[PDB]
């Protein structure tokens, strides 16, 4: 047992309050193993995090950890998975199955969703924890 990387993502969607968009999401720390691939989707099957939205692709994007070559800590990689809608990460649009390495902090966006992500490094390499946080107000401007 040692310090663990934490990825914290703050979400906003306008009208998150209406049809239980975020109904299926836990807003508590979760610990996960590095081996896992985290998916985000409209499909209760095969997603850790599920959005009850007609407009979010059945699977929307996924995270995946690794470590850089000369680095002693874990980093995240985000891949898009939606033919329909592009994933914008800090102004760069990712098409279907495009992927990239995540900055320590970034805005990930798609449709009217907004995710603000922020990583804090840990010692550990076999587990990481993720935490969801809710934003009252839009994270732009």
């Amino acid at each position: 047992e040692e310090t663990v990387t934490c990825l914290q993502m703050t979400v906003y969607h306008p009208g998150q309050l209406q049809c239980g968009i975020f109904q299926s999401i836990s807003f508590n720390r979760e610990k996960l193993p590095s081996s896992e691939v985290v998916k985000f989707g409209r499909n209760s099957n095969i997603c850790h995090y599920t959005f009850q939205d007609k407009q979010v692709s059945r699977v929307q994007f996924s995270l995946q950890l690794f470590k850089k070559f000369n680095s002693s800590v874990l980093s995240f990689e985000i891949k898009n998975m939606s033919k329909k809608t592009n994933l914008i990460v800090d102004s760069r649009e990712l098409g279907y199955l495009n992927k990239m390495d995540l900055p320590y902090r970034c805005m990930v966006r798609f449709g009217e969703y907004q995710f603000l992500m922020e990583k804090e490094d840990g010692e550990s390499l076999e587990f990481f924890e993720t935490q969801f946080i809710l934003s009252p107000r839009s994270l732009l401007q």
Partner: peptide, 12 residues
């Protein structure tokens, strides 16, 4: 009626 998890993705 519509089946939710499996439906097509809707744009709008």
């Amino acid at each position: 009626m519509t089946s939710f998890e499996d439906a097509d993705t809707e744009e709008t």
